[PDB]
Amino acid sequence: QLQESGGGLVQAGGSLRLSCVVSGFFFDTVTMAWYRRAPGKHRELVASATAGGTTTYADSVKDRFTISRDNAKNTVYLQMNSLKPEDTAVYYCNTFVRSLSWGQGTQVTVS
Amino acid sequence: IQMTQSSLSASVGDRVTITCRASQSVSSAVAWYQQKPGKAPKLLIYSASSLYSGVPSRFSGSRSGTDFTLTISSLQPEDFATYYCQQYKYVPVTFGQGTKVEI
Amino acid sequence: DESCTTASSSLAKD
Amino acid sequence: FVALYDYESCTETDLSFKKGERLQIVNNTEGDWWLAHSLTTGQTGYIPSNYVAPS
Amino acid sequence: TRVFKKASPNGKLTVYLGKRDFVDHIDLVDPVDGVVLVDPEYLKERRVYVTLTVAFRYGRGLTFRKDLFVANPLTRLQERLIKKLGEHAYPFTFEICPNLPSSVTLQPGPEDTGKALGVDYEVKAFVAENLEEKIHKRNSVRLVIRKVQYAPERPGPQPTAETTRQFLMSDKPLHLEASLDKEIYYHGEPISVNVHVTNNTNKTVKKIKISVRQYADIVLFNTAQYKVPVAMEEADDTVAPSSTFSKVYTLTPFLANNREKRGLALDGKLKHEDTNLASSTLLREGANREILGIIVSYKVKVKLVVSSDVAVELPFTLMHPKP
Amino acid sequence: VESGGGLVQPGGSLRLSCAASGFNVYSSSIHWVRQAPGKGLEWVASISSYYGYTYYADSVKGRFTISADTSKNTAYLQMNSLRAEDTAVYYCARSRQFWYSGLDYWGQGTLVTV
C-alpha cells in the first residue's frame, strides 16, 4: 500500500509541491513515477525518477517540473511550478509499471 | 464488505443519475434490481450497463473504477419504483439502501 | 518473493 | 530426428508432421525453436524443441 | 471497458490482457493481445521477452507443454493500450491455431492437494541479458487465461434410438423407444427422456434404470477413456407382458452427489475455485486428435431389467449458450 | 405463488413454502431473501441444488435451515427459533446458476408476522 501528501487549491502564478510515501520493497532500486487523471478520462503520465537519481520525462510539456527521489526516507517528491488550467486534475503516484496497489490520489485545482 | 447507494425527483421527461459506490475491488460484478411496491424484484441491469431483455433503451448504466451509476435516459411514467444495487463477487451478497422516485 | 494478485485497469471507450 | 506425437500448425513458417523420422538438421538449434527438413514431406520450417528424439 | 493487469514483485514489470476467456470459433480462434510495461532501468541491459505456454498436467514436474516464444498487425486493443501507456509499452501478440485444446480441469481427489490437473494457458514476461540466465523468479509475471467454446445455434434432429430384441425364448421382440426432446441441452436443464415400451414376451420389466453417463478421454494417454455415472435414477415402474407404457422422466446431471467421484472433468479453473461440469468439445474439421487436451461428451443411458437386460444409449449436446 | 406461515405464538417456528413453475431446481439456484417493513432488502439464505452448498447471513446461520425438494420445485425456509425481529416479507428466488448470480426470477412474497 502507498499514501500521498500535498494537494489542494492553487491559483495561477504560484507553485505547489507534492510527495508520496511507499511501503514494501517497491522503492529502492525501482524508478518511481507520478500520474494525473483528467475528470472522466484515463490517467496521464507526468514524470519519473530513476534508480540512479536522474530523470526522464514522458510528459508532452517537459517544462518547470522538479523530481526528487529519496532512497532512504521512503518518499518521492514531485514539484509543480508552471501552473496552467490543464493542470486542474487529480494527481496520483505509483511505479512506472504501476505495480503497487493503485490507491487514493491527491487533487490539485487552479482557477 | 458493504455498498452504499434516497429520493429522486419525478419530473417526467428528464435524465436522472444514481450512484452506488462500492467499498472493495468488486470488479464491476454489479446488478441493479427494481421492484414495484408489493411485488418481487425485477432486474434491469447486470455487470456493466447491460439492460434486461424486458426493458426499453430508457435505462442505462455506467462504471468508473469502483464507482457505479444507473441513469434513466428519459423519464416516462412507467417507472417510479425503488432501485436496488447488488454485487455478486463475495459470498455475503449485499444490497444498496435503495431510492424511490417522488417529486 | 511471492506472486502479485492479477488486477485490472481502465482504457477509453473509443 | 524422430517425432513422437502429432503436431499441426496454422503458420506458414512452421512445419506440421505426424511423428516424422530422420528430420534433417546440421546440429542443434541456436535459439529455443528448432529447424527441420523432411524428405518424405518436402517442406522446411521451424518445429518446437520438445518433439525431437535422437537417431 | 476494462483490461486485465498483473504486476511483478520486483516492481519493474506489468502485463496487460484484454480478456482471460478467449472464445474459440469454429474456424478462427481469438488472438492473445496485450502490452508489457517495463522499467527502462533494467531495459537498458536487454529488452523484454514474452512467453505464451500451454501445459497439460496429470499424475501428482510431470507436464507436457507447448511453449511459443516471442522477444520484444496492431489490433485496436493494442493501439488503445499503447496510446494510454506510452513509449515503453512494447506490444506482443500470439495467434492460437484452432487445433489446440480448451481449458478443462479434473476433479481433485480428497487425498491430494494440487493446483489442478488439466490444460492451462499462461502468459509470461521477464527481463534477462541472456536466454539462459533465468535466476530470479522475482523478476517475472505469471498470468493464467482460458480458451472456451459455446453451443452452436443450429440444433440437430430429435435424438432417438430403439431396440427390438426377443428375450431368450420369446415370440416377438420387445420394442423400447426413447426420445430426448432436443440435442442441445444447456448445463443443468432437465433431460425429458420420453419412454415408450410395448411387449408380447412373457418377460416384464421390474425396474427401469435411467442415468446420464459422462464420457471423457485423455488423448495423450493410451487407452484412456473414462466414463462415470451421473444423476443415476432407478424407478420401479413395471410393464407386464401385453401392455403399453409412456412417461416423461426429468433427469438432471448435477455435481452435489458426484463431488466424491475421481476424474470428473469440470470447466477450467483459474484459482483453486469450483466450477460446473465440463462442457462438450466442438470441432468443424476432420481434425487429427491433438496430443494435448481432454475431449468431453455426454450420453444418456436408459436401461430395462427383467426376471436378462436390454438398454439403448442416446447422445446429446451439453454446452452453455452463446452470450 | 407462495404459502407463508404464521398463526403461532411469538418465538414459534414456521416453514415457508415457495413455488415457481417452469424452471429446474438444479439448473436454477434457489435464493431466499427478507425485507423488514421500513428496512431495505437483505439476503438471508441461498441454496445451490446443483452444487450442494448453502450460505446464510451470519445473523441467521444457526437459526435457519433451508431445504428445497428436487421433484416438487418448492423452497422452504425452516426458521427453527425466530424472534420479534424476524417479522418481514420474504421472497424466494430462482436465479441462473452458471457463471451468473442474478436472481432473474421470483415468486410471491408472504408475510411471516402473526
Numbering used by the authors:
A (entry chain A): 3 to 113
B (entry chain L): 3 to 7, 10 to 107
C (entry chain V): 355 to 368
D (entry chain C): 86 to 140
E (entry chain B): 6 to 65, 72 to 83, 96 to 330, 341 to 356
F (entry chain H): 8 to 121
Original authors' sentences:
Beta-arrestins (βarrs) are key regulators and transducers of G-protein coupled receptor signaling; however, little is known of how βarrs communicate with their downstream effectors. Using cryo-electron microscopy, we elucidate how βarr1 recruits and activates the non-receptor tyrosine kinase Src, the first identified signaling partner of βarrs. βarr1 engages Src SH3 through two distinct sites, each employing a different recognition mechanism: a polyproline motif in the N-domain and a non-proline-based interaction in the central crest region. At both sites βarr1 interacts with the aromatic surface of SH3, disrupting the autoinhibited conformation of Src and directly triggering its allosteric activation. This structural evidence establishes βarr1 as an active regulatory protein rather than a passive scaffold and suggests a potentially general mechanism for βarr-mediated signaling across diverse effectors.
To elucidate the mechanism of SH3 recruitment by βarr1, we formed cross-linked complexes with the best mutant pairs SH3_95C–βarr1_120C (SH3–βarr1-CC) and SH3_95C–βarr1_92C (SH3–βarr1-N) and determined the structures by cryo-EM. The map obtained from the SH3–βarr1-CC complex has a global resolution of 3.47 Å and showed a rigid interaction with SH3 in the central crest area of βarr1. The complex was activated by V2Rpp and stabilized by Fab30 and nanobody 32 (Nb32). βarr1 adopts an active conformation, characterized by C-tail displacement and inter-domain rotation, and binds to the aromatic surface of SH3 containing residues from the RT loop, nSrc loop, and the 310 helix. βarr1 interacts with SH3 using β-strand V (residues 75–80) in the N domain and a part of the lariat loop in the C domain. Y90 and Y136 in SH3 interact with F75 in βarr1. The side chains of Y136 and N135 in SH3 are well-placed to make hydrogen bonds with the main chain oxygen of R76 in βarr1. Additional hydrogen bonds are possible between the main chain oxygen of E93 in SH3 and the side chain of N122 in βarr1, as well as between W118 in SH3 and the main chain oxygen of D78 in βarr1. In contrast, the recruitment of SH3 via the βarr1-CC site is driven by the non-proline residues in the β-strand V and the lariat loop and two proline residues after the β-strand VI. The most dramatic changes are observed in the central crest region of βarr1 in the Src–βarr1-CC and SH3–βarr1-CC complexes. SH3 binding to βarr1-CC drastically changes the position of β-strand V: it shows a downward and inward movement by ~9 Å and displays a two-residue offset in its N-terminal part and a three-residue offset in its C-terminal part as compared to active βarr1 without SH3. Furthermore, the middle loop in SH3–βarr1-CC adopts an intermediate conformation between the fully active and fully inactive βarr1 crystal structures.
